[PDB]
PDB file of C-alpha atoms in Angstrom:
ATOM      1  CA  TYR A   1      12.890  -9.662 -35.539  1.00  0.00           C
ATOM      2  CA  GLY A   2      13.106 -13.453 -35.717  1.00  0.00           C
ATOM      3  CA  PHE A   3      14.562 -15.327 -32.752  1.00  0.00           C
ATOM      4  CA  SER A   4      18.151 -14.067 -32.442  1.00  0.00           C
ATOM      5  CA  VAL A   5      20.351 -10.994 -32.842  1.00  0.00           C
ATOM      6  CA  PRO A   6      23.515 -11.847 -34.827  1.00  0.00           C
ATOM      7  CA  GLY A   7      26.830 -10.372 -33.761  1.00  0.00           C
ATOM      8  CA  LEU A   8      27.875  -9.417 -37.303  1.00  0.00           C
ATOM      9  CA  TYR A   9      26.074  -7.489 -40.026  1.00  0.00           C
ATOM     10  CA  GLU A  10      26.852  -7.176 -43.741  1.00  0.00           C
ATOM     11  CA  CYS A  11      25.896  -3.739 -45.055  1.00  0.00           C
ATOM     12  CA  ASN A  12      25.887  -2.436 -48.634  1.00  0.00           C
ATOM     13  CA  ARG A  13      23.986   0.854 -48.341  1.00  0.00           C
ATOM     14  CA  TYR A  14      25.164   4.145 -49.794  1.00  0.00           C
ATOM     15  CA  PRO A  15      27.587   5.813 -49.035  1.00  0.00           C
ATOM     16  CA  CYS A  16      29.386   2.616 -47.991  1.00  0.00           C
ATOM     17  CA  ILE A  17      31.647   1.329 -50.766  1.00  0.00           C
ATOM     18  CA  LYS A  18      30.624  -2.144 -51.991  1.00  0.00           C
ATOM     19  CA  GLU A  19      29.990  -4.281 -48.862  1.00  0.00           C
ATOM     20  CA  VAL A  20      31.232  -3.656 -45.318  1.00  0.00           C
ATOM     21  CA  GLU A  21      31.111  -5.518 -42.012  1.00  0.00           C
ATOM     22  CA  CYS A  22      29.609  -4.018 -38.852  1.00  0.00           C
ATOM     23  CA  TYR A  23      29.581  -5.236 -35.255  1.00  0.00           C
ATOM     24  CA  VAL A  24      26.644  -5.186 -32.847  1.00  0.00           C
ATOM     25  CA  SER A  25      26.549  -4.378 -29.127  1.00  0.00           C
ATOM     26  CA  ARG A  26      25.340  -6.913 -26.543  1.00  0.00           C
ATOM     27  CA  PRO A  27      23.873  -9.448 -29.006  1.00  0.00           C
ATOM     28  CA  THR A  28      23.409 -12.138 -26.342  1.00  0.00           C
ATOM     29  CA  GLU A  29      21.455 -10.038 -23.846  1.00  0.00           C
ATOM     30  CA  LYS A  30      19.205  -8.817 -26.649  1.00  0.00           C
ATOM     31  CA  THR A  31      18.618 -12.400 -27.800  1.00  0.00           C
ATOM     32  CA  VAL A  32      17.662 -13.427 -24.260  1.00  0.00           C
ATOM     33  CA  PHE A  33      15.293 -10.466 -23.960  1.00  0.00           C
ATOM     34  CA  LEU A  34      13.687 -11.294 -27.311  1.00  0.00           C
ATOM     35  CA  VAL A  35      13.067 -14.931 -26.389  1.00  0.00           C
ATOM     36  CA  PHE A  36      11.706 -14.026 -22.953  1.00  0.00           C
ATOM     37  CA  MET A  37       9.255 -11.506 -24.404  1.00  0.00           C
ATOM     38  CA  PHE A  38       8.102 -14.031 -26.996  1.00  0.00           C
ATOM     39  CA  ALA A  39       7.444 -16.622 -24.286  1.00  0.00           C
ATOM     40  CA  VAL A  40       5.487 -14.192 -22.104  1.00  0.00           C
ATOM     41  CA  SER A  41       3.371 -13.056 -25.054  1.00  0.00           C
ATOM     42  CA  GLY A  42       2.655 -16.676 -25.958  1.00  0.00           C
ATOM     43  CA  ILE A  43       1.463 -17.394 -22.426  1.00  0.00           C
ATOM     44  CA  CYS A  44      -0.819 -14.357 -22.609  1.00  0.00           C
ATOM     45  CA  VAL A  45      -2.223 -15.546 -25.943  1.00  0.00           C
ATOM     46  CA  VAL A  46      -2.953 -19.013 -24.560  1.00  0.00           C
ATOM     47  CA  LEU A  47      -4.749 -17.606 -21.516  1.00  0.00           C
ATOM     48  CA  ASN A  48      -6.812 -15.250 -23.680  1.00  0.00           C
ATOM     49  CA  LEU A  49      -7.811 -18.118 -25.971  1.00  0.00           C
ATOM     50  CA  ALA A  50      -8.872 -20.169 -22.952  1.00  0.00           C
ATOM     51  CA  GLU A  51     -11.016 -17.277 -21.718  1.00  0.00           C
ATOM     52  CA  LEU A  52     -12.624 -16.803 -25.136  1.00  0.00           C
ATOM     53  CA  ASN A  53     -13.377 -20.523 -25.374  1.00  0.00           C
ATOM     54  CA  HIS A  54     -14.961 -20.440 -21.918  1.00  0.00           C
ATOM     55  CA  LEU A  55     -17.272 -17.598 -22.940  1.00  0.00           C
TER      56      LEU A  55
ATOM     57  CA  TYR B   1      52.399  -3.397 -67.077  1.00  0.00           C
ATOM     58  CA  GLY B   2      50.139  -2.835 -70.084  1.00  0.00           C
ATOM     59  CA  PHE B   3      49.722   0.696 -71.416  1.00  0.00           C
ATOM     60  CA  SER B   4      48.184   2.669 -68.533  1.00  0.00           C
ATOM     61  CA  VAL B   5      48.141   3.025 -64.749  1.00  0.00           C
ATOM     62  CA  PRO B   6      44.540   3.173 -63.451  1.00  0.00           C
ATOM     63  CA  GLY B   7      43.674   5.607 -60.688  1.00  0.00           C
ATOM     64  CA  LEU B   8      41.640   3.059 -58.710  1.00  0.00           C
ATOM     65  CA  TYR B   9      42.413  -0.470 -57.560  1.00  0.00           C
ATOM     66  CA  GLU B  10      40.118  -3.180 -56.183  1.00  0.00           C
ATOM     67  CA  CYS B  11      41.905  -5.351 -53.627  1.00  0.00           C
ATOM     68  CA  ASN B  12      40.703  -8.539 -51.925  1.00  0.00           C
ATOM     69  CA  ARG B  13      43.848  -9.831 -50.207  1.00  0.00           C
ATOM     70  CA  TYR B  14      44.062 -10.926 -46.590  1.00  0.00           C
ATOM     71  CA  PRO B  15      43.741  -9.259 -44.073  1.00  0.00           C
ATOM     72  CA  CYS B  16      41.391  -6.944 -45.988  1.00  0.00           C
ATOM     73  CA  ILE B  17      37.747  -7.856 -45.379  1.00  0.00           C
ATOM     74  CA  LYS B  18      35.936  -8.861 -48.591  1.00  0.00           C
ATOM     75  CA  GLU B  19      36.928  -6.283 -51.259  1.00  0.00           C
ATOM     76  CA  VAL B  20      38.245  -2.755 -50.699  1.00  0.00           C
ATOM     77  CA  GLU B  21      39.079   0.225 -52.902  1.00  0.00           C
ATOM     78  CA  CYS B  22      42.521   1.849 -53.020  1.00  0.00           C
ATOM     79  CA  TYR B  23      43.785   5.010 -54.695  1.00  0.00           C
ATOM     80  CA  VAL B  24      47.033   5.459 -56.614  1.00  0.00           C
ATOM     81  CA  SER B  25      49.492   8.367 -56.646  1.00  0.00           C
ATOM     82  CA  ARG B  26      50.266  10.283 -59.855  1.00  0.00           C
ATOM     83  CA  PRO B  27      48.622   7.843 -62.301  1.00  0.00           C
ATOM     84  CA  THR B  28      48.902  10.245 -65.254  1.00  0.00           C
ATOM     85  CA  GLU B  29      52.629  10.946 -64.966  1.00  0.00           C
ATOM     86  CA  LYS B  30      53.302   7.224 -64.644  1.00  0.00           C
ATOM     87  CA  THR B  31      51.183   6.527 -67.729  1.00  0.00           C
ATOM     88  CA  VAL B  32      53.136   9.129 -69.707  1.00  0.00           C
ATOM     89  CA  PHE B  33      56.441   7.650 -68.538  1.00  0.00           C
ATOM     90  CA  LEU B  34      55.310   4.138 -69.479  1.00  0.00           C
ATOM     91  CA  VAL B  35      54.278   5.152 -72.995  1.00  0.00           C
ATOM     92  CA  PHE B  36      57.469   7.146 -73.562  1.00  0.00           C
ATOM     93  CA  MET B  37      59.681   4.244 -72.494  1.00  0.00           C
ATOM     94  CA  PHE B  38      57.742   1.873 -74.739  1.00  0.00           C
ATOM     95  CA  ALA B  39      58.224   4.181 -77.728  1.00  0.00           C
ATOM     96  CA  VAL B  40      61.960   4.571 -77.116  1.00  0.00           C
ATOM     97  CA  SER B  41      62.420   0.813 -76.760  1.00  0.00           C
ATOM     98  CA  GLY B  42      60.502   0.257 -79.992  1.00  0.00           C
ATOM     99  CA  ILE B  43      62.773   2.675 -81.839  1.00  0.00           C
ATOM    100  CA  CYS B  44      65.806   0.831 -80.474  1.00  0.00           C
ATOM    101  CA  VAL B  45      64.356  -2.504 -81.609  1.00  0.00           C
ATOM    102  CA  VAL B  46      63.736  -1.192 -85.125  1.00  0.00           C
ATOM    103  CA  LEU B  47      67.276   0.165 -85.429  1.00  0.00           C
ATOM    104  CA  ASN B  48      68.763  -3.104 -84.167  1.00  0.00           C
ATOM    105  CA  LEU B  49      66.703  -5.089 -86.674  1.00  0.00           C
ATOM    106  CA  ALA B  50      67.911  -2.817 -89.472  1.00  0.00           C
ATOM    107  CA  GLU B  51      71.520  -3.381 -88.407  1.00  0.00           C
ATOM    108  CA  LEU B  52      71.060  -7.156 -88.241  1.00  0.00           C
ATOM    109  CA  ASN B  53      69.443  -7.181 -91.685  1.00  0.00           C
ATOM    110  CA  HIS B  54      72.359  -5.171 -93.063  1.00  0.00           C
ATOM    111  CA  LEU B  55      74.873  -7.692 -91.723  1.00  0.00           C
TER     112      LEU B  55
END
């Protein structure tokens, strides 16, 4: 997924003719959710590594 | 105009986004009309040249 959800998409899949432009819903909220989940998962990873090192 | 009227056109003029496809009305009749007018004009040109040469 990367780190952001763009508001525009360029699509060239059949049956679309040549290349078309499509528009996404709530890109900003989805970006915020993505970043927050990444941060929480990183914290979990750090704590798990600390535990493993302690063992 | 050339010698034919194609049935499809590819257009990339503002405000159209990128390139779009457009469809023409009665391409075959217009092609026939174009060729017929060209032939008649050519006959007229030949006759006029013959007259001028005679003078």
